[PDB]
Structures are given as structure tokens and as C-alpha cells.
Design a protein around this ligand. Sequence first.
Ligand SMILES: [Mg+2]
Ligand SMILES: [Mg+2]
Ligand SMILES: [Mg+2]
Ligand SMILES: [Mg+2]
Ligand SMILES: [Mg+2]
Ligand SMILES: [Mg+2]
Ligand SMILES: [Mg+2]
Ligand SMILES: [Mg+2]
Ligand SMILES: [Mg+2]
Ligand SMILES: [Mg+2]
Ligand SMILES: [Mg+2]
Ligand SMILES: [Mg+2]
Ligand SMILES: [Mg+2]
Ligand SMILES: [Mg+2]
Ligand SMILES: [Mg+2]
Ligand SMILES: [Mg+2]
Ligand SMILES: [Mg+2]
Ligand SMILES: [Mg+2]
Ligand SMILES: [Zn+2]
Ligand SMILES: [Zn+2]
Lengths: 128, 135, 61, 81, 232, 104
Amino acid sequence: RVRTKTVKKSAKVIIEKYYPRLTLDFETNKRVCDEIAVISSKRLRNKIAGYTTHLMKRIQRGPVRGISFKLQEEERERKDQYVPEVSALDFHQNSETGMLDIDQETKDLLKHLGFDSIPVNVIPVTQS
Amino acid sequence: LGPQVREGELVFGVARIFASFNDTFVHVTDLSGRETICRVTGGMKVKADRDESSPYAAMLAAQDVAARCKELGITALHIKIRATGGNGTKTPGPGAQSALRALARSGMKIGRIEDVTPTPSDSTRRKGGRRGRRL
Amino acid sequence: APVKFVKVTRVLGRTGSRGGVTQVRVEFMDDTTRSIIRNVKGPVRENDILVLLESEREARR
Amino acid sequence: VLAVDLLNPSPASEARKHKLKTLVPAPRSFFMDVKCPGCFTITTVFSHAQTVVICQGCTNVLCQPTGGKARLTEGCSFRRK
Amino acid sequence: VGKNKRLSKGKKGLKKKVQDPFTRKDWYNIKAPAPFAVRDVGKTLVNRTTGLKNANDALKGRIFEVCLADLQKDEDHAFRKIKLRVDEVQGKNCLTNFHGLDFTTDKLRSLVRKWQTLIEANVTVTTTDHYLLRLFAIAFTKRRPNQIKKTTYAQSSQIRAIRRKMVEIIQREAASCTLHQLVSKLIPEVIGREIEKATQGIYPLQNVHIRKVKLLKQPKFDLGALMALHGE
Amino acid sequence: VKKRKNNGRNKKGRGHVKPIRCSNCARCTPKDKAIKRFTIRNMVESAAIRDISDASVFAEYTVPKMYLKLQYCVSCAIHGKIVRVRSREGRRNRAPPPRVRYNK
RNA sequence: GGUGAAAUUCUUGGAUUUAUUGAAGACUAACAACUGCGAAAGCAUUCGCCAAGGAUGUUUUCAUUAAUCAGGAACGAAAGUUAGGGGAUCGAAGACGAUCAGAUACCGUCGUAGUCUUAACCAUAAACUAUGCCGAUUAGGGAUCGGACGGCGUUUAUUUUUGA
Ligand SMILES: [Mg+2]
Ligand SMILES: [Mg+2]
Ligand SMILES: [Mg+2]
Ligand SMILES: [Mg+2]
Ligand SMILES: [Mg+2]
Ligand SMILES: [Mg+2]
Ligand SMILES: [Mg+2]
Ligand SMILES: [Mg+2]
Ligand SMILES: [Mg+2]
Ligand SMILES: [Mg+2]
Ligand SMILES: [Mg+2]
Ligand SMILES: [Mg+2]
Ligand SMILES: [Mg+2]
Ligand SMILES: [Mg+2]
Ligand SMILES: [Mg+2]
Ligand SMILES: [Mg+2]
Ligand SMILES: [Mg+2]
Ligand SMILES: [Mg+2]
Ligand SMILES: [Zn+2]
Ligand SMILES: [Zn+2]
């Protein structure tokens, strides 16, 4: 009992083009599909309605890869501008003592570049 | 008839199980090889040459060994299983484990498991030739 | 002969050259702790009950 | 690579190459003067001496030959000359 | 199989009359020497004494294999088994003395491992009492906790150094001893700790052991010493 | 043509090596050419472990181990299904197979 | 006993099996590896004696003494040959038992030369890296055996320097 590509493509395109007007109930999708589509077979219409009602059962509980609908995309670009008030890299507020930790030859690198005024503490690292 | 002993203590014997790929031997002595309490082999138990080394035949041979040694008074056993050894397979045969289980189930006591297969440091030439058994 | 009653708890594939025999895990229904592996000739369901003449013998795998 | 100045290698790289693989070979052995605690004399000893070196006074051993550079006696001091 | 015999008893024979030879057997107890903890070690069987066939002669050349764990009542020495040889048989009481020592086969095979070095030696020695006995020794290379290199191999020149040091130590220890004193030295594994301590500088050498001991010659019977050790 | 770069022997830097006897057909093959398998198993099978445990006289008991090292000729190697034919590209891969540690 | 299954063969004139002791000859398991040495053939138990060798280290010494080689010469697995010693185990030839239409074979039980050593011949092998010897240059990597040099630590001893 495996559905072919014609149903797979028709179910995906109907779901993404017309998401909200049809719901998890199979009976409603049965009359929704044939009114807004031209299908030459009754059983094939049943094939589409039966598989298409299966998708919203799992979409209702978590999103699924490979399917995108109008409501779903708009959520992404509203959420993607999230930004805190204090930077994670910023440590003047994040760390109680502003001064941070580096290693010895990093301090030597700072000496070479001339940025001596940066307040840091050097700790040796070696296991051997 | 048997050794006099208080009910609490139990007396020990030793069973030397020889399991090759053609036959199995169960032989029970008394912590030394001078005296043989009992010996039984698969051949008596089985009715056909093919099955003389079978686990079932080894189980049958172990049952009447336990029965025969029950009235002698011995109540616990040490076991020393060995394969063909020497130039042989050095892997115990199929009828090894069978008899051991039948000995445990029959009511006999067990202690000091051991393997006594003889291994050579450097052996003489072994039978077969330079090309081996070509079948 | 002390015939014993055993019951099957799980079926593990179908073995044999011709698929007649099946290999199962049985339970002795007298010491619920004990369990061994046996072979059966006929159809077997879960919770079936079998009659065993001898229990010491064991099957392959 | 593809552009190197072979005439002026770094001193570290020439202290890093083999004694024969440099631009011009140069030995890495030296002489040294050892102060024997017993006496006040001075003796010049090769760093890689293959023979036991004896001091003029009190006839004491100063070094033991080995595969590489000779090992000095524990109770001795030296300066690189 | 019953039906394979062709000649059976042979050219010409007849069945037997008297059977069940166990009606004429006797049971004896076996004891252990002084240093060991438990003395009773089991029972033994033999034909009853009769004319022309004395019983005591048959109980003077028997040896028994007893694990040292049972004798010492301690499961740490569960991999060493020793032999006991009977010498004199007092009434319903067999007396025995030392006859050797040996590891079990499985412990020995479990120790030998790949990517290590195995060191082995042997030496004969005689005591103040004229007993000539031979000892074997074994050791293996030891890994270091911070080691990264896969294999731990020693150089053969170092190997000869360890073999010489072990032989010298074992000879020194067994130079002035008696059998009772020496046996009192095997059970606490005294030899190993000096072998490892002495060879510590050359190489770590974990798991130093004496593989086996066997005796070759014996002096006169000297019943006084046997009774000295027995019946304590 | 070379089927294998190492001639299927693993021998470079020497001229000769003493042979051994096959453990199945008693054939002679060079030691470096033979297939070696080391096996560690228990003395008794897992169903019998308890039967030995409660039939012992030492309270808790630990069954000893058994150690063998078998070695076969190549003719017995793929008839006993120890190893099998690999593809042309898969031949040059000497990493030991990853044993299953979950068993479904 | 042995085999896919059997037989030839040995056995109450006690076979097979168990323990103790003795003699003889051969061989050095596990450790043993994408590790070592030698011109190659080849070389694995301990220790003593004899001469030889590679690599590294060196502000020692001589100063072109060199490279490859027609003919020529030394060594040269296994098998084989000529005389002594030794002769456990395997086993060409040979004799039996099965299989098969046949089976002078593959399988099984015996078994001579041979397999070992001393003194001499033989000079051939898929003697293979199927890849001649000397010298120069050309790309990245990480392992590993021997010697030397530098370094932070751990371990440990009549302990430091050494060894790991
Ligand atoms: Mg074939
Ligand atoms: Mg070479
Ligand atoms: Mg060759
Ligand atoms: Mg007999
Ligand atoms: Mg010999
Ligand atoms: Mg090596
Ligand atoms: Mg060896
Ligand atoms: Mg020529
Ligand atoms: Mg030859
Ligand atoms: Mg010859
Ligand atoms: Mg003559
Ligand atoms: Mg001859
Ligand atoms: Mg043949
Ligand atoms: Mg033969
Ligand atoms: Mg040619
Ligand atoms: Mg050629
Ligand atoms: Mg060539
Ligand atoms: Mg250093
Ligand atoms: Zn001085
Ligand atoms: Zn094979």
C-alpha cells in the first residue's frame, strides 16, 4: 500500500497552495479537493484526500522537512531578527571582573602589535 | 561399604573427561590415578558408530556414572577435561559440555574447574604431508 | 516418566531446512525463573502450552 | 616557496640544519677549562674527548669517554671557553 | 555397541565367577605438613592388607595434586597447585611431604600478551639439607601510565641484565635454607619483591613470579625429621 | 598482473620465514601469510553458568576462561567463511571490522 | 581406531583409558609484529670462548688511492650421489581396506630409501621486488628501528648524573 508520484505531487502542491481551508478530517478534504481540482477518477480523488489528510496530522505536531506553506514561511523571517541586548562576546557586563584570560604568547602578540592597554591576565598552560 | 564420616563433611573424587572428535571418555578416580572408582564411555551407551561422540551419548554415559558413584560414598567431584592434545585439535569435542551438565543436574557437587590438555613446546612432524588432506 | 509441562514465551524466527520447525523460548511453569530454547514442529502462538518428555536436551543457537 | 633569499638564511635555521648541510660547514664542538676542586690548576679538555684526561696534580680522573660528548666528573665545574 | 565384538575373549575363554572387588577395599585419611593451615586433605582407597601383599608398600609412592588455596584457606592463592608425596603410613593416617609446585595453565596463558616482552629463567640449587631442586622464574614488561607508544619492548642487552640479576638473587636466597624454611618463603611470595626491587632501575618488570619448582634427588629417609614436621 | 601490492604475504626486508601447519587440513604455509585468529571464551555456556554456580561448593564462583589461537591456510579461510571476497576498491582496506556493540 | 558413512587393525593372553618411573632421537610453540641482521641462499632455548660487521660521534690520519666489468674465481635452498654414526616422528617405492562402470589416485591402517650428523661431490629453483650497478635533481604527511643533541615534568633505587 504505497502511493505513487502523481498523488505525492498533487498532495504537496494542494497543501502548499491551499493550507488553511482544509483540516485533519478526511470527509471535508474529500469535498475540498474535487471542487478546486480537475480529477478524472473517483478512487484517485479518494487517494489524494486520504493521503493529504495524513499530512496535517503530523504537521499539527511539529513541522516536517520538505513541506512549506504560507503561514509557515512568514514565521521564519519574523523570528530570524532575534538579538539580545548584551553581546555574548561582550564581557564587561557578562564577566563580573572585566579583565579576561589569555595565554603567554598571546600576550606577547599583543606586545608586538602595540595594544598593551588591554586589561588581561596571563596564565601558563602545559601538561607534558 | 563406604568411608565412615559425619553427615556434615563431604568427600571428594576427581573425574577426568577426555573429549575427542570420535569418542568421549568419563573416568573417575580418587585424587590420584592409582585407584579407579568407575569408567564409562560413549560406545556402550550408543547403538551406532556415527553417534558415539554425540552430546546425547555423553549425557547418558554421565548419568550412570553418577548413579554408580553414589553408593561408593563420594559426594563431591573435581573435573579435569582434556582434548586430544599433542598434535591433535586441542579443542574439546562436542560431547564435552553435555556430560558436565548431566553431572551437575544429577546431584553431584563440583569444585576446582581445570583444563589439562597437553601442549608441546616444539613437536615432531605431524601427519598429512605438505599438501594436507585434499578433501 | 516424569513428564513436564512448559509454555512458550517468545518466537525467534523460523529455522530448519524446510521451515517446518520453529525455534522458541519456553518457560517451565513450575520454576518461573528457568527458561530454555527448544524446537517445535507445528504452529505456535504466544502463551501456548507444550508437553515435554525430556528437558535436558538443547537445540542449536 | 617560489621566492626565497638563499644568501641570507636565518641564524636559527642555520643552528637548525645539519653540520654538513649548511651554506658553509662549521663544527659544533668546543674546548673547555675545568676547575678541579682539589687543586687550583687549569686543564684544557676537548668536549668530545675519547680518552680519559688526567690532571697534572694528584692524578685524578676528569672525564669519561662515551658515544657523543664526554661526561664530566660530578664534583667538577667548567666554563665554556 | 554390543554387536561389534567378533573374537570377544579371544581364541578360547570362559566367563568369570567372583565380581565386585570393592568388598576388600580400605579407606585411609591424608594429612598435611606443619607450615600449612589445614591438615586433613581428604580420603584415599586401597586394597586390604593380606598375606604376601602388604598394604603399607602400596601407600609409600603416591602423590596428590592439591590446590594451595584449600590448604591455606585463602582464595588469593587460587592459581597455584602443589604435590604431596606419601612417605610413612601410620594406622589409618597417611603422612606426606612436599613434592613440587606449579601454576595452573589458564593463569599462565592469561598473562602472556602481545606487544610485550617475556623474560624467563631457571636454575638448580641445593640446600643445607642435601635436597637438589630446580626453580623456574618468569616476568613481563610493564607499561607506564602516561605512555602513548603502542608497544613496550626491551632491548636484548637489557634482557640479559635482568636474567643475570634474577639468577644471582635466586641463588643467594636459596643458598642457606631448609625445605620447611623455603616453603615458608614461597607462600608469601618473598622472592618476587626483591626481584622487582633489584631490577627496578633497569626496567619496571611487573608480575614477577616463580613458575614452578621440582626436586630431583633425595637423601636417606630419616624418619625423625618427618615425624618432627608431622603431628604438631 | 599484480592483484595485490604486497603479494598477499606481508614480507619485505627478508628472504625466508619458517612455515606452520594449517589447523584444519594440516597444510604448510608461511607464518606471515597465514590468517591468525585469537579467541577468548568461557569454559561453559551461558545457560549452564548458573547450573555450575549452584552446583559448586565454593559459595560464589568464577568460571575460568579458555584461550585459543587458530591459524588457517587461505583455502580453508574462505571455505570456513572466516573471510570472504571483497570488491576491487574494498580490497585495500586493512582496518578491522567494527563489531556490533548494540545488537539491536 | 578412523570417516560424509564403513572396513583393513588392536583387544578379558586385559585392548582403549588413569597415575608414577626410565631410555632414545628430532624440534625450539605462545611472546612473534606491514619489526631486526646478512652479498644472496638464509638466520629464533640458556650460558662460555673465538674472530668478523653496520650505523652514529670526531677541530684524528693518508691524499685520488675511484665506478662498472669479457674470460677467471668464492659462496650457493630442496632433492640427489660416495663412505661411517644415528634411526623417535613423518613418509617416495610397495602391500592391504573403501569409493567408482573402471581408480595402479584423492580417503584410512602399515611401511623401505629419505628426513639428522661427520668427510667429500653436484651448482640447478616462480634462486621474484618477474624491476642490473654508481651519481644528481624533483611533493605533502604521519608512524617506526639504531646513534647523537635540546627540554618541562613523573617514577624510582645507598636513590643524585644514569634507567623508564
Ligand atoms: Mg576442495
Ligand atoms: Mg637488508
Ligand atoms: Mg626465496
Ligand atoms: Mg590396561
Ligand atoms: Mg630427546
Ligand atoms: Mg627484534
Ligand atoms: Mg621459546
Ligand atoms: Mg663473466
Ligand atoms: Mg643441500
Ligand atoms: Mg640429504
Ligand atoms: Mg665397506
Ligand atoms: Mg648412510
Ligand atoms: Mg596415503
Ligand atoms: Mg604411518
Ligand atoms: Mg635459470
Ligand atoms: Mg630472472
Ligand atoms: Mg637480481
Ligand atoms: Mg635527553
Ligand atoms: Zn688535582
Ligand atoms: Zn587448511
